[PDB]
Ligand binder design. Structure first.
Ligand SMILES: *[C@@H]1O[C@H](CO[C@H]2O[C@@H](C)[C@@H](O)[C@@H](O)[C@@H]2O)[C@@H](O[C@@H]2O[C@H](CO)[C@@H](O[C@@H]3O[C@H](CO[C@H]4O[C@H](CO)[C@@H](O)[C@H](O)[C@@H]4O[C@@H]4O[C@H](CO)[C@@H](O[C@@H]5O[C@H](CO)[C@H](O)[C@H](O)[C@H]5O)[C@H](O)[C@H]4NC(C)=O)[C@@H](O)[C@H](O[C@H]4O[C@H](CO)[C@@H](O)[C@H](O[C@@H]5O[C@H](CO)[C@@H](O)[C@H](O)[C@H]5NC(C)=O)[C@@H]4O)[C@@H]3O)[C@H](O)[C@H]2NC(C)=O)[C@H](O)[C@H]1NC(C)=O
Ligand SMILES: *[C@@H]1O[C@H](CO[C@@H]2O[C@@H](C)[C@@H](O)[C@@H](O)[C@@H]2O)[C@@H](O[C@@H]2O[C@H](CO)[C@@H](O[C@@H]3O[C@H](CO[C@H]4O[C@H](CO)[C@@H](O)[C@H](O)[C@@H]4O[C@@H]4O[C@H](CO)[C@@H](O)[C@H](O)[C@H]4NC(C)=O)[C@@H](O)[C@H](O[C@H]4O[C@H](CO)[C@@H](O)[C@H](O)[C@@H]4O)[C@@H]3O)[C@H](O)[C@H]2NC(C)=O)[C@H](O)[C@H]1NC(C)=O
Lengths: 206, 207
């Protein structure tokens, strides 16, 4: 049996309206031993808010038991430490897995929008590029809009550790060349904890 | 018991006949009770005997580590031949087998575009030169920066990202002093991929 611990979504922790949560996933539970017990602690103090989602039966005669704990936005952003304690009959000793936010001074991202290369103008579609660099930690959310409507044909690279100790990434939005040439306005939206109101956007148009 | 890992060649090694592409089979957690290890190599299911096995190395956790390296032909790898490493040990109920090959699928030619720094970034001491590569399959690729015939140092490249059409794309960012950019120096982004003619292409960028 193995224990995995997953952090909340960056967008959930940056907006008060949303609900962030820490997920503790237990895999490779055998048929003979389906009993799994969960204990949650926050900086040592034990909490009792966790809930256990229904367990799945996978393609190899095992079970995946998942426990979810809701966290406060400010506790996570302050660097509080969350640990998941798992006990099972097959285990010799209880397993403890620990997670928290990355430590360090947060740094404000810089957002630049880049128009399509002149070479790409011969194609039927063009690439709109959003460059975000110099931010820390790596938790971040990027979205594209146009006239207040979310564009959906975009892909974002994972954060990459830059040479100065910060992170950078690129986001690529693909639109029809006709939409670009007509003067439409496209925006790149960035959410990070070091930004004022955790939000900024840069526009891009011909 | 022992665990087996199988590593593919480096992309530059398969794309240039001057270099030597290799496939590495690694066996870890070999106990002192049964330190003997045997390797059997198979190319498309046919056994080969030109592999080089290196003497076992004792790790500080009281376990041995044995490595076997097979040299491959460039055209064999690019044609999708499967390579199989078979590891035999007396502590194993059965031999362990691992197979590796190039990703299946029709190759697609990369498109390379160079993007100048954003006008907003010109207020900084450092500016960002962006190289965009998209539409390539498989994801094995090499991206390098150079200027005036000499390689550049301060560049980073993102991992390949699966796009919406089933092909890959990535970005490479070169960081230079604004003074060098504004003086008209020419920076070029060179890309190595199997779908390219001569496996090499180059796109320049300057002011
Ligand atoms: C028998 O079957 C078992 C189950 O069957 C399934 O498993 C597969 C075989 C597959 O074929 C399935 O078809 C099959 O049904 C199987 O159990 C396997 O075991 C695997 C390992 O043995 C394990 O792989 C690991 O996966 C994790 C992450 O897994 C997530 O992502 C995958 C996709 O990549 C998802 O498919 C999966 O469901 C998991 O989902 C993520 O977790 C949650 C839950 O969804 C999400 O978070 C929440 O999301 C919600 C919304 O959905 C909310 O947003 C909420 O707020 C969130 O919290 C999360 O988003 C999901 N992810 C995504 C993308 O959506 C990988 O991380 C593992 O990679 C490891 O790689 C190295 C190599 O060892 C490890 O070292 C490393 O560990 C850590 O690395 C850190 C580095 O940063 C380091 O700091 C740590 O110290 C280090 N830890 C340790 C201990 O070293 C990584 O962990 C790895 O690939 C499979 O996930 C698991 N199955 C399932 C279903 O989970 C058995 O193997 C199989 N065989 C046998 C013999 O039993
Ligand atoms: C006893 O100790 C062994 C050696 O550890 C070292 O020595 C001891 C004394 C300590 O000092 C250690 O701190 C020290 O590290 C352990 O062996 C290790 O076992 C683990 C698994 O149990 C192996 O992890 C696997 O690593 C794969 C990648 O490994 C490459 O990259 C490593 C750096 O990140 C590098 O250290 C490796 O040597 C290897 O390097 C590549 O080698 C090839 C061929 O030589 C080259 O072509 C590449 O260019 C090299 N690349 C680089 C970057 O250098 C992972 O891919 C792999 O993950 C895969 O499998 C897991 C399942 O386990 C999947 O979940 C995952 O998705 C993925 O598919 C895995 O993590 C590790 O490599 C071993 N170390 C060595 C040196 O071989 C023993 O485990 C330990 N025994 C016990 C009981 O503890």
């Amino acid at each position: 049996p193995s224990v995995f611990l997953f952090p909340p979504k960056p967008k959930d922790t940056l907006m008060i309206s949303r609900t962030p949560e820490v997920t503790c996933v237990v895999v490779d539970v055998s048929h003979e031993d389906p009993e799994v017990k969960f204990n949650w602690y926050v900086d040592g103090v034990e909490v009792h808010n966790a809930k256990t989602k229904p367990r799945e039966e996978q393609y190899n005669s095992t079970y995946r038991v998942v426990s979810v704990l809701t966290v406060l936005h400010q506790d996570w952003l302050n660097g509080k430490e969350y640990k998941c304690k798992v006990s099972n009959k097959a285990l010799p000793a209880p397993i403890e897995k620990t997670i928290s936010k990355a430590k360090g001074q947060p740094r404000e991202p810089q957002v630049y929008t880049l128009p399509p290369s002149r070479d790409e103008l011969t194609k039927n579609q063009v690439s709109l590029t959003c460059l975000v660099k110099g931010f820390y930690p790596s938790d971040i959310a990027v979205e594209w809009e146009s006239n207040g409507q979310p564009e959906n044909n975009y892909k974002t690279t994972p954060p990459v550790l830059d040479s100065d100790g910060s992170f950078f990434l690129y986001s690529k939005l693909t639109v029809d060349k006709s939409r670009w040439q007509q003067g439409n306005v496209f925006s790149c939206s960035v959410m990070h904890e070091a930004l004022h109101n955790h939000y900024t956007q840069k526009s891009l148009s011909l």
